[model samples]
Target: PQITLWQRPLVTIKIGGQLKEALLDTGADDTVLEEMSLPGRWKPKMIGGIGGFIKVRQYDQIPIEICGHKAIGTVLVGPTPTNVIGRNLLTQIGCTLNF
Candidate 1:
């Protein structure tokens, strides 16, 4: 399961039981979804990026399957243009950068 990291490391992933295209962002520390119905109570968080910061719902213990590997971690529901599989979830799959 060697997914080459390039300008964009895009891959299909299963989150919250649905399949969606997501980017493997080594620069990010948390995984974010475009939008989803999250269970349990979550706190409001603001994340900054190239543009600006946006409010997000941060919840923990969610299931995310990437490349046939199942992982559980914090998933943010927000206005992200695309889903991001960040280091928090990436590490669970043993994803590493070979420089």
Candidate 2:
């Protein structure tokens, strides 16, 4: 059976006190926030990844609204190709991507 994933438009989220629009990616397992958007108050904890866990400090939790749904969680600041709306946020709203 073929299952369809419903993708949502990129949403602007506040990170480190900055608002950035990010693509909602339901495939991601964790909350991936942009390293550049990190706030000065929160120190990132380094963690390992598939390549290798590095220092990824925990920052302040931001409240984000998507499709009228909202969630507040700690974001992991890291260097990404672009901002990503990972599963942590999407699952909370029971969202699925649409092709």
Candidate 3:
């Protein structure tokens, strides 16, 4: 579907076998999610955004499904205000803006 800007860029996503809602943030470089348990080991990382820098656990090669598209990539687990599907995953899912 050709989503319109008038509507929020919110979308459903599945990560680590859990279904969750996330926002498609085209401006973000990496996808960030709320605090939750994710399988496999993770590396400590620091990421900065509109809210400033924050520490997070970076899990690589994690399986995630955007809407219905399957993808494997890195995900940042942290205390974000909301789940964000950044360009990292957006590109994989072929989500682009056209106006």
Candidate 4:
């Protein structure tokens, strides 16, 4: 099935056995989620956008399921306005945009 990027490409995904909503962002290179307590230490990562910059903790090997497609890799959890799934995982799911 194909998905249109007419508006916000929001989708429900599961991570750490928890369900959360995320936006599929083609512009982003990595996936990011809202800050939460995880069972590990992390290095600081600063990223900027129109809204401004935010510091995040980069965690590796986090399993995220989207549209029945599972992807495990680097996932940053921080003070994000919303959860965003980027190319890293999108490619794993074969997600592409169409007009």
**Which prediction has the highest TM-score against the true structure?**
3
Write down the worst ten-residue block by lDDT for model 2. Answer: 1-10
Of 1 and 4, the candidate ranking higher by lDDT: 1
All predictions: root-mean-square deviation over Cα? 1.3, 4.9, 1.0, 1.5
- Highest-scoring model, lDDT: 3
Compute each candidate's TM-score over C-alphas. Answer: 0.91, 0.59, 0.94, 0.89
Q: Which digits, one per residue and each the tens of the lDDT, describe model 1 over residues 35-93?
A: 78867779999998889988899998998888889999999999998788899998999
Kindly list the per-residue Cα lDDT of model 3 for residues 1-98, writing each as its tens digit. 67677887898898887899998898889999999999998999999987699899999998899877998889999988889998888889898888
lDDT values, one for every candidate = 0.87, 0.64, 0.89, 0.85
> How far in Å is the alpha carbon of 27 misplaced in model 4?
0.7
Ranking by TM-score: 3, 1, 4, 2
Query: Poorest 10 consecutive residues of model 4 by lDDT?
Result: 35-44
Q: Please say which candidate is ahead in lDDT: 3 or 4.
A: 3
Compute the lDDT of residue 62 as modeled in candidate 4. 79
Query: What digit string (tens of lDDT, one per residue) describes model 4 on residues 1-99?
Result: 677666887999988878999999999898889977655567789987778999999888777899888888788889888899989999989887765
Put down candidate 2 lDDT per residue, 39-99, tens digits, no spaces: 4467757654567665655665666665556787667777655667778777777776545
